[PDB]
């Protein structure tokens, strides 16, 4: 799968609108498992279930544990660039 970089716009009150699985301890990439309707990832239209999150705003998540990826992702604000590939 070709790498894509996708920008989403998040207001402060809302989450990213995704569920993720995986991470280093699981021996698989951080994977989008759900796209929540009406939330930023859905509104932006470039992120899909089955996409691996390789990086976010230039933070490499290829080798991060699940919880650390969650924390990094949950810290992002405003306009947020995802580097993703469909697995």
């Amino acid at each position: 799968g070709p790498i894509r970089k996708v920008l989403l716009l998040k207001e402060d009150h809302e989450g990213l609108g995704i569920s993720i699985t995986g991470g280093k301890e699981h021996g698989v990439p951080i994977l989008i498992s759900e796209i929540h309707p009406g939330q930023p990832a859905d509104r932006c239209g470039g992120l899909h279930v089955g996409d691996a999150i390789l990086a976010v705003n230039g933070v490499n998540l290829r080798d991060t544990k699940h919880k650390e990826a969650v924390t990094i992702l949950s810290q992002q604000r405003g306009e947020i660039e995802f580097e993703v590939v469909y697995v």
Binding site: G15, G17, S19, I20, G22
Partner: peptide
């Protein structure tokens, strides 16, 4: 026994 987090 599966890790899934909503974000």
């Amino acid at each position: 026994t599966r890790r899934e987090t909503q974000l």
